[PDB]
Amino acid sequence: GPSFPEPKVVRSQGGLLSLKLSATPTPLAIAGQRATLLTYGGSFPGPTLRVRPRDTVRLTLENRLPEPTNLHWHGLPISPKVDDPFLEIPPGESWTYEFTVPKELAGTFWYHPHLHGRVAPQLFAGLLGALVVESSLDAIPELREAEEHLLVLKDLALQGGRPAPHTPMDWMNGKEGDLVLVNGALRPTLVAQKATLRLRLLNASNARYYRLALQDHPLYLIAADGGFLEEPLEVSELLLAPGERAEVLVRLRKEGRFLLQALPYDRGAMGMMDMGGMAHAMPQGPSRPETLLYLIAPKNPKPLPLPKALSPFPTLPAPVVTRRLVLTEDMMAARFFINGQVFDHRRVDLKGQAQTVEVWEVENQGDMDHPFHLHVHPFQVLSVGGRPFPYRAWKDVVNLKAGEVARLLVPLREKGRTVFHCHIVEHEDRGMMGVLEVG
Ligand SMILES: [Hg+2]
Ligand SMILES: [Hg+2]
Ligand SMILES: [Hg+2]
């Protein structure tokens, strides 16, 4: 096969992507060992769905798991009557999701389960795949001539040839695994044929963070979770929290081998100690550095020039309401809260008006990082930790370190009931989720 493994792509045909996927336990070879995972389409990751604005998607999900499941069309601004976080597909049953891809949309999105209390074990076991919305912007020479790859960043732990079970500690911290994989492969080699790479990045991990840095190179950020930036932004490193996506250009500077690494990062995970009296909780400290892939540059690389511009960000109407959402933790109970409450699917927490803009102030009063995700309604991050964001782009997950406040500009789009929650998925399963109704 190609030296760099990527999920198989399924493309829309004549404006229609019609596909049947089964969620099924699947024996496969992964990282040199045999394991049974839970997969879509018999693969890990699931197939990449590649569509264009205005395409029709018709996806029938058959549930061959022993428990209920569903899909969340993560990042897509579509109706929560389709992207329905309350829908349960029982074992053996099927459900067809049908929607039209919005006209003003581009980027890397993804699909995975969202059923309260069951997300963490299902996602950890392999139920995830990417969804790419192609853009006319993709035809500009500076992108068209780049070598494009998808990197699905997802870790795993195996026990007895199956995904390792969640421990009590995993429910508190979010589960991380020792196998730190890219597209299900262990430290693959990417032998570049072109000097400019266009990498679409997806953190599909339950809880692991990826503090991305390419040896000897900067990265040029060109898209966030849900759309292009206005122009490329040069960065020395790029943190991807669980659920986040990004697209970068890499301009290879000389021949040789360069490591793409996940550098040490302390997200506030905790261990337990006993040193005289307490059987007390203690910081795990930063993650160990990981090599994600080996990038081999071609001979005499001469990168394309960067595009001068990408996509102008919409000028939003003035906001009509400000919200405050405070995140807190009870670590020893593995319970997590928004404004002092745990999720209740019967309880509406916020009621907003379609087509108005709201300001959401999300404050992390816990001691761990908490990435905050809102379904259905992409947002513009204005600032985090009191620092203004250095670009304008659509996001749907925003990371908050302990004590930080994020201020978000949230246009409400589709009407209906949807959810917002922590995307360390164990924390969502353990209560850190609320309900928004848009009318
Ligand atoms: Hg998600
Ligand atoms: Hg969700
Ligand atoms: Hg969290």
Where do we find the tokens 């102030």? 361
* Domain ranges for the chain: 1-134, 135-311, 312-439
Ligand 3 centroid from CA 369, angstroms: 7
Residue 185 CA to ligand 3 center (angstroms) comes to: 27
Which ligand sits nearest to residue 369's alpha carbon?
A: 3
Question: How many angstroms separate the alpha carbon of residue 423 from the centre of ligand 2?
Answer: 7
Q: Please say whether the beta carbons of 4 and 127 come within 8 A.
A: no
> Count H helices, E strands: the chain?
4, 36
Distance 75 CA to ligand 1 centre (A): 8
Q: Which long-range contacts (CB under 8 A, 24 or more apart) does 333-337 make?
A: 334/168, 334/171, 334/172, 334/426, 334/430, 335/430, 335/431, 336/366, 336/422, 336/427, 336/428, 336/430, 336/431, 336/432, 337/431, 337/432
278 CA from centroid of ligand 1 (Å): 37
- The span from the CA of 408 to the CA of 44, in Å, is 34
Which residues 6+ apart lie within 8 Å of 328 measured at CB? 336, 337, 340, 365, 366
Cα(397) to ligand 1 centroid in Å equals: 9
Q: Quick check: 188 and 238 in contact, CB under 8 A? A: no
- Regarding the domain delimited by 312-439, which CATH topology (the fold level of the hierarchy) does it fall under? Immunoglobulin-like (2.60.40)
The ligand whose atoms approach the alpha carbon of 243 most closely is 1
Q: Ligand 3 center to residue 119 CA distance, Å? A: 13
135-311 has which CATH code?
2.60.40.420
SS3 136: helix
Nearest ligand to residue 205 Cα: 1
**CA 243 / ligand 1 centre spacing (Å):** 5
Task: Identify which ligand lies nearest to the alpha carbon of 328.
Answer: 3
Same topology for domains 135-311 and 312-439, yes or no? yes
Q: What are 217's two structure tokens?
A: 């190179």
- Residue 122's H or E segment, with its range, is helix 119-124
Q: What is the resolution of this structure in A?
A: 1.7
Q: Across the chain, which distance is largest between two alpha carbons, in Å? A: 69
CATH fold of the domain at 1-134:
Immunoglobulin-like (2.60.40)
Task: List the Cα angle 330/380/368 in 5-degree steps.
Answer: 20
**From which experimental method does this structure derive?**
X-ray
> CA-based angle 241:380:305, to the nearest 5?
80
- Ligand 2 center–CA 420 separation, angstroms: 7
> Which chain residues have CB less than 5 Å from ligand 2, an ion?
114
Residues constituting the chain: 439
From the annotation, which residues make up the binding site for Cu(2+)?
72, 74, 112, 114, 280, 370, 373, 375, 421-423, 427
The dihedral formed by the CA atoms of 380, 386, 389 and 392, expressed in degrees to the nearest 10: 30
Strands 94-100 and 189-191: unpaired
Residue 21 Cα to ligand 2 middle (Å): 20
Distance CA 393, CA 49 (A): 22
Distance 100 CA to ligand 2 centre (A): 20
Quote the ligand 3 centre to 25 CA distance (angstroms).
Answer: 28
Residues annotated within the binding site are 72, 74, 112, 114, 280, 370, 373, 375, 421-423, 427
